């Protein structure tokens, strides 16, 4: 059971960051522009079994756009992403939406204002009304703080499975290998463990 998801929006809005946070748990701080599209399998566990999204993470920068609306063909759902610290990225939400619905009439779509963790917010909550008439779900999100980071996938899962009571649930946990190699007998230990100790953990001023 797998569904095509296209993720669209202006460059720098946090699409690839949002996806990477869901794939690996990581917070990517650098801006490495997506070239055309990158496809990533993402599975969630639900009270109605596993749901899989083939996530088509697309380029927001015109000069890196690649196949553009060519990526939307046969999409079963979508996320439009803008940046609450950048008014131009919200002003472009209608253009992304147009390009998307001309290829994907009648699919479920989430509008996401990313970077709500940032103090000096430019696109205020009261400005954000574009989703009403176009029947999009809207969420304030942060890939950095993880605020509402699960909601886009939870809402879409609910609409694609047609069950509004669908919850994420605790993925099963098999008993891990009890026989393991002593890592201290593997030579590169001293080289790997010194590098790791003397590289500082990021964000030592966070609460965790």
């Amino acid at each position: 059971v797998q569904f095509k998801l296209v993720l669209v929006g202006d460059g720098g809005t946090g699409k690839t960051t949002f996806v990477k946070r869901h794939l690996t748990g990581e917070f990517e701080k650098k801006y490495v522009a997506t070239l055309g599209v990158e496809v990533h399998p993402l599975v969630f566990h639900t009270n109605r079994g596993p749901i899989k999204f083939n996530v088509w993470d697309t380029a927001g920068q015109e000069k890196f756009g690649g196949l553009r609306d060519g990526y939307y063909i046969q999409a079963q759902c979508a996320i439009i992403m803008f940046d609450v610290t950048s008014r131009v990225t919200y002003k472009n939400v209608p253009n992304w939406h147009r390009d998307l619905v001309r290829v994907c009439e009648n699919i479920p779509i989430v509008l996401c204002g990313n970077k709500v963790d940032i103090k000096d917010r430019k696109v205020k909550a009261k400005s954000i009304v574009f989703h009403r008439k176009k029947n999009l779900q809207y969420y304030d999100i942060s890939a950095k703080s993880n605020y509402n980071f699960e909601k886009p996938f939870l809402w879409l899962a609910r609409k694609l499975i047609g069950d509004p009571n669908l919850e994420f649930v605790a993925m099963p946990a098999l008993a891990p290998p009890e026989v393991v190699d002593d890592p201290a007998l593997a030579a590169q230990y001293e080289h790997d463990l010194e590098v790791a100790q003397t590289t500082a953990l990021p964000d030592e001023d966070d609460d965790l």
Binding site: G25, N146, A170, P177, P183, A184, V195, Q197, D206
Partner: protein, 130 residues
Amino acid sequence: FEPVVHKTMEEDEEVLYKVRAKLFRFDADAKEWKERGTGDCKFLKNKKTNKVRILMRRDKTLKICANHIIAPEYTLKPNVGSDRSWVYACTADIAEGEAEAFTFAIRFGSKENADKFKEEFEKAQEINKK
């Protein structure tokens, strides 16, 4: 009168220690820590084998970011940046499927928590020997 008619794999385990934590893995290629998840770190003692594992699930997704035996062989080490973290090499974590090796770092909310974790981590290691 007839009535109107109507598995995590943690049910066989006991919770010895619970603490809120952020877990990282070291990417040797990039030489940077990358977060693997934030949530409850649990020490789970299997009631049948008395084996103690780390199990840790990300908040909201509840997805496993750590599943491994608290091996006698492993050693907690400080990290230059932090008085509230430990670093260690794990040779068999199954969070993301097949047995892989990782260099983990785990940070806590306070030095007290990190010192408690270390104390509990070594208690579980004694339990795993017997």
